């Protein structure tokens, strides 16, 4: 003897179309590009000027676009941080992506007789067998 | 016999048996979502690497 | 596999719309440059107004091998 | 040059003169490829074994004591009939004193008041709790540590005062648990389903917020350019 | 000895525990360690403080015989009505607590929940000897090179 | 008669396709050929004006 | 471009830039795409 009983769902992360974290996925990070821009401008205009982003976003997206390196060295060593910036939110994306799909799910089904579930009984589970067999 | 517990306040007027299941006083909490660490994992690579 | 082909030839329109405004077989070898996390020597295509659908490419690209690395280590855990 | 490559990125970047420079940057590239590839297994080893950390822990707790600085401040929720009343009444008399406003009717109407937001936390005995928490149609968060209890007690059968029948209750039911007959016992008493059998956790990041650290990493260099940019005043003075 | 031998289902383990039984539990603690003795019964108050210094061993979960140490006294002496009421009242105003915690949960290695997911990263050596041997070789290489180069 | 068919054991494991749709990924991108041609026209009007 | 071509390669396998020229040929362009993608 055995007992039988229905399958679930679960979902796939499909959903998930470059969107786990879409609400704190921010456009603040975009303000900060933004902003390291404008800060490299600062920093190049009174020690190239409107290319920054140009810079920045090649920076952050691993795309090689045609730009100069910043002349002052006081914008170098914010542009070590900011691509090690870049390489840490890179691979923590990369840990939270494998996390959604390493990890299975709850509602650990009945098992056997000696289940509370089965033994003690309540209205939230309905047993049943066909009338006048060996069961 | 049933849920009775065992304090000093009952033990002047009744006399008590052995205990009986393990108990006390706690405390349950809400059912919060998971958290992760409140930082990236920046434990000791910095110590060598 | 197949939708990676035909969502990559799209963009020789574009290509030849900025020098109207490299395509031959200059553009299809900076596209899988990238999309495939390669610092081969390739030219960018020329002016401002080229600069933004390589743009786009590489948030496809990020997103894609991130995407890849991941369902591979799930699979081979499991 | 040196940083680009090893933290990914095609930085537009000179590469040296001649090709006997070439070498060393080609032992770099193999450090690089190397060096991220552990990174990111590490850290993914890393984010799907570490365990939810049990936000309050203790009565003796600022959460617990006088809640000053807390938006919304924290709802104690107790039974004001019974044992519990009478040991918290003489320890903490201000904690029942802020608590007479957050009064329950019942056990299973504390499990609603605790599903519905209206309660943060509640208080009550061990066993039933330790009861309820086995039995609740999901296995969220239960209770806080594992069993730790604050005032260490038992149940009991109560008894009429210096009767003669004590002393043989008192030797049959220590000859119970000379038999094994209460774990015989147990399969109608506590067990039950997912009593913290997965210590599992799984998270939607929007709690991904405390990246604040690696955005004060950020703004650190934010002061460091500026003041590296001041003493970029010296060739004034040289 | 007592529980063992009560037990009738259990006789024939007890049959087996009789040719390996130790007289203090310092030597079997210590007997363990050098693995003479694979495992030991005991109580759960001795065995979860040894489990956080002697930082080796582990217990193992489950319990049998649920008990609590108590205060043995003469029968029918005077005291045995004072004596159950403070420890009652030392229960309550939280004199234990303060008692376990300075003497028995004051110290804790980490709770062996087997978690690999940790560091040790702590030597390096064989991932950066590749650069720390091209360092030393490349100038070599770069001599042969310009030998060539002066050559021809 | 009887172990003749399947569908799949169901070992519950997760890691498999069903990478069937892509829509949301590559909207990015059929969003952008369609909006970038009308921001050439902007920039190069700029570049007729000025 | 013909003793060049390792540096090229290797140049295509561990990451790092090299100054270095694309192959004329298409013939060896349709072999650099699958060296790319292994």
Same mark, same amino acid.
């Given at each position: 003897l055995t007992i039988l009983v229905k399958k679930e769902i679960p979902r796939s992360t499909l959903d998930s179309?470059?969107?786990?974290?879409?609400?704190?996925?921010?456009?603040?990070?975009?303000?900060?590009?933004?902003?390291?821009?404008?800060?490299?401008?600062?920093?190049?205009?009174?020690?190239?000027?409107?290319?920054?982003?140009?810079?920045?976003?090649?920076?952050?997206? @691993?795309?090689?676009?045609?730009?100069?390196?910043?002349?002052?060295?006081?914008?170098?060593?914010?542009?070590?941080?900011?691509?090690?910036?870049?390489?840490?939110?890179?691979?923590?994306?990369?840990? @939270?992506?494998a996390a959604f799909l390493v990890l299975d799910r709850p509602e650990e089904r009945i098992t056997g007789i000696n289940d509370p579930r089965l033994r003690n009984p309540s209205d939230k589970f309905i047993y049943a067998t066909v009338k006048?067999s060996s069961v | 016999?049933?849920?009775?517990?065992?304090?000093?306040?009952?033990?002047?007027?009744?006399? =008590?048996?052995?205990? =009986?299941?393990?108990?006390?006083?706690?405390?349950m909490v809400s059912r919060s979502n998971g958290?992760?660490?409140?930082?990236?994992?920046?434990?000791? =690579?910095?110590?060598?690497? | 596999?197949?939708?990676?082909?035909?969502?990559?030839?799209?963009?020789?329109?574009?290509?030849?719309?900025?020098?109207?405004?490299?395509?031959?077989?200059?553009? !299809?070898?900076?596209?899988?440059?990238?999309?495939?996390?390669?610092?081969?020597?390739?030219?960018?295509?020329?002016?401002?107004? #080229?600069? !933004?659908?390589? #743009?786009?490419?590489?948030?496809?690209?990020? !997103?894609?091998?991130?995407?890849?690395?991941?369902n591979?280590?799930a699979f081979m855990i499991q | 040059?040196?940083?680009? *490559?090893?933290?990914?990125?095609?930085?537009?970047?000179?590469?040296?003169?001649?090709?006997?420079?070439?070498?060393?940057?080609?032992?770099?590239?193999?450090?690089?490829?190397?060096?991220?590839?552990?990174?990111?297994?590490?850290?993914?080893?890393?984010?799907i074994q570490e365990e939810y950390? %049990?936000?309050?822990?203790? *009565?003796? $707790?600022?959460?617990?004591?006088?809640?000053?600085?807390?938006?919304?401040?924290?709802?104690?929720?107790?039974?004001?009939?019974?044992?519990?009343?009478?040991?918290?009444?003489?320890?903490?008399?201000?904690?029942?004193?802020?608590?007479?406003?957050?009064?329950?009717?019942?056990v299973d %109407?504390?499990l609603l008041?605790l599903k519905?937001?209206?309660?943060?936390?509640?208080?009550? $005995?061990?066993a039933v709790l330790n009861y309820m928490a086995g039995r609740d149609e999901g296995c969220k968060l239960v209770t806080?540590?594992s069993g &730790?209890?604050?005032?260490?007690?038992?149940?009991?059968?109560?008894?009429?005062?210096?009767?003669?029948? &004590?002393?043989?209750?008192? *030797?049959?039911?220590?000859?119970?648990?000379?038999?094994?007959?209460?774990e015989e016992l147990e399969a109608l008493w506590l067990t039950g389903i997912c009593h913290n059998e997965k210590n599992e956790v799984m998270s939607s990041?929007?709690?991904?917020?405390?990246?604040?650290?690696?955005?004060?990493?950020?703004?650190?260099?934010?002061? *460091?350019?500026?003041?590296?940019?001041?003493?970029?005043?010296?060739?004034?003075?040289? | 000895?007592?529980?063992?031998?009560?037990?009738? /289902?259990?006789?024939?383990?007890?049959?087996?525990?009789?040719?390996?039984?130790? /007289?203090?539990?310092?030597?079997?603690? +210590?007997?363990?360690?050098?693995?003479?003795?694979?495992?030991?019964?005991?109580?759960?108050?001795?065995?979860?403080? /040894?489990?956080?210094?002697?930082?080796?061993?582990?217990?193992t979960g489950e319990?049998?015989?649920?008990?609590?140490?108590?205060?043995?006294?003469?029968?029918?002496?005077?005291?045995? +009505?004072?004596?159950?009421?403070?420890?009652?009242?030392?229960?309550?105003?939280?004199?234990?607590?303060?008692?376990?915690?300075?003497?028995?949960?004051?110290? /804790?290695?980490?709770?062996?929940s087997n978690?690999?997911?940790?560091?040790?990263?702590?030597?390096?050596?064989?991932?950066?000897?590749?650069?720390?041997?091209?360092?030393?070789?490349?100038?070599?290489?770069?001599?042969?090179?310009?030998?060539?180069?002066?050559?021809?």
């Amino acid at each position: 003897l055995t007992i039988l009983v229905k399958k679930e769902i679960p979902r796939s992360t499909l959903d998930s179309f470059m969107q786990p974290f879409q609400s704190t996925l921010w456009l603040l990070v975009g303000l900060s590009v933004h902003v390291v821009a404008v800060m490299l401008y600062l920093l190049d205009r009174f020690s190239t000027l409107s290319s920054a982003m140009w810079f920045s976003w090649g920076v952050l997206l @691993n795309s090689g676009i045609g730009e100069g390196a910043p002349r002052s060295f006081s914008a170098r060593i914010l542009g070590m941080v900011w691509a090690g910036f870049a390489m840490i939110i890179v691979a923590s994306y990369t840990a @939270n992506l494998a996390a959604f799909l390493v990890l299975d799910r709850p509602e650990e089904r009945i098992t056997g007789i000696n289940d509370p579930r089965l033994r003690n009984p309540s209205d939230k589970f309905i047993y049943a067998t066909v009338k006048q067999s060996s069961v | 016999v049933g849920s009775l517990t065992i304090n000093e306040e009952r033990s002047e007027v009744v006399d =008590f048996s052995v205990p =009986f299941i393990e108990t006390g006083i706690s405390v349950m909490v809400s059912r919060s979502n998971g958290t992760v660490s409140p930082s990236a994992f920046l434990e000791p =690579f910095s110590a060598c690497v | 596999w197949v939708m990676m082909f035909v969502m990559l030839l799209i963009v020789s329109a574009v290509a030849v719309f900025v020098f109207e405004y490299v395509t031959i077989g200059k553009a !299809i070898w900076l596209l899988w440059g990238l999309v495939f996390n390669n610092s081969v020597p390739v030219q960018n295509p020329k002016g401002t107004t #080229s600069k !933004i659908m390589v #743009s786009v490419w590489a948030f496809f690209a990020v !997103i894609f091998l991130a995407s890849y690395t991941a369902n591979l280590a799930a699979f081979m855990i499991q | 040059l040196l940083w680009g *490559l090893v933290f990914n990125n095609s930085v537009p970047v000179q590469n040296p003169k001649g090709t006997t420079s070439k070498i060393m940057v080609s032992v770099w590239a193999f450090f690089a490829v190397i060096f991220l590839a552990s990174y990111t297994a590490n850290l993914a080893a890393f984010m799907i074994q570490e365990e939810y950390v %049990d936000q309050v822990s203790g *009565l003796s $707790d600022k959460k617990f004591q006088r809640p000053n600085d807390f938006s919304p401040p924290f709802r104690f929720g107790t039974v004001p009939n019974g044992s519990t009343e009478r040991n918290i009444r003489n320890n903490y008399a201000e904690m029942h004193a802020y608590m007479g406003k957050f009064n329950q009717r019942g056990v299973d %109407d504390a499990l609603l008041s605790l599903k519905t937001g209206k309660l943060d936390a509640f208080i009550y $005995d061990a066993a039933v709790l330790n009861y309820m928490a086995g039995r609740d149609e999901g296995c969220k968060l239960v209770t806080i540590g594992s069993g &730790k209890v604050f005032a260490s007690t038992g149940y009991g059968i109560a008894i009429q005062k210096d009767s003669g029948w &004590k002393r043989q209750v008192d *030797l049959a039911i220590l000859q119970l648990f000379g038999d094994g007959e209460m774990e015989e016992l147990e399969a109608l008493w506590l067990t039950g389903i997912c009593h913290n059998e997965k210590n599992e956790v799984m998270s939607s990041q929007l709690d991904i917020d405390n990246m604040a650290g690696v955005f004060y990493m950020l703004g650190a260099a934010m002061a *460091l350019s500026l003041i590296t940019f001041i003493s970029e005043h010296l060739f004034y003075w040289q | 000895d007592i529980y063992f031998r009560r037990q009738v /289902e259990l006789s024939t383990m007890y049959r087996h525990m009789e040719k390996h039984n130790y /007289e203090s539990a310092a030597e079997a603690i +210590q007997a363990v360690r050098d693995n003479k003795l694979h495992a030991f019964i005991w109580d759960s108050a001795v065995l979860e403080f /040894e489990a956080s210094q002697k930082c080796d061993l582990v217990t193992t979960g489950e319990l049998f015989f649920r008990s609590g140490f108590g205060i043995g006294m003469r029968k029918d002496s005077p005291w045995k +009505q004072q004596v159950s009421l403070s420890i009652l009242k030392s229960h309550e105003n939280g004199f234990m607590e303060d008692l376990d915690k300075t003497w028995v949960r004051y110290q /804790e290695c980490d709770s062996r929940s087997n978690a690999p997911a940790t560091l040790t990263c702590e030597n390096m050596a064989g991932v950066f000897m590749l650069v720390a041997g091209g360092i030393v070789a490349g100038i070599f290489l770069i001599f042969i090179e310009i030998a060539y180069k002066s050559r021809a």
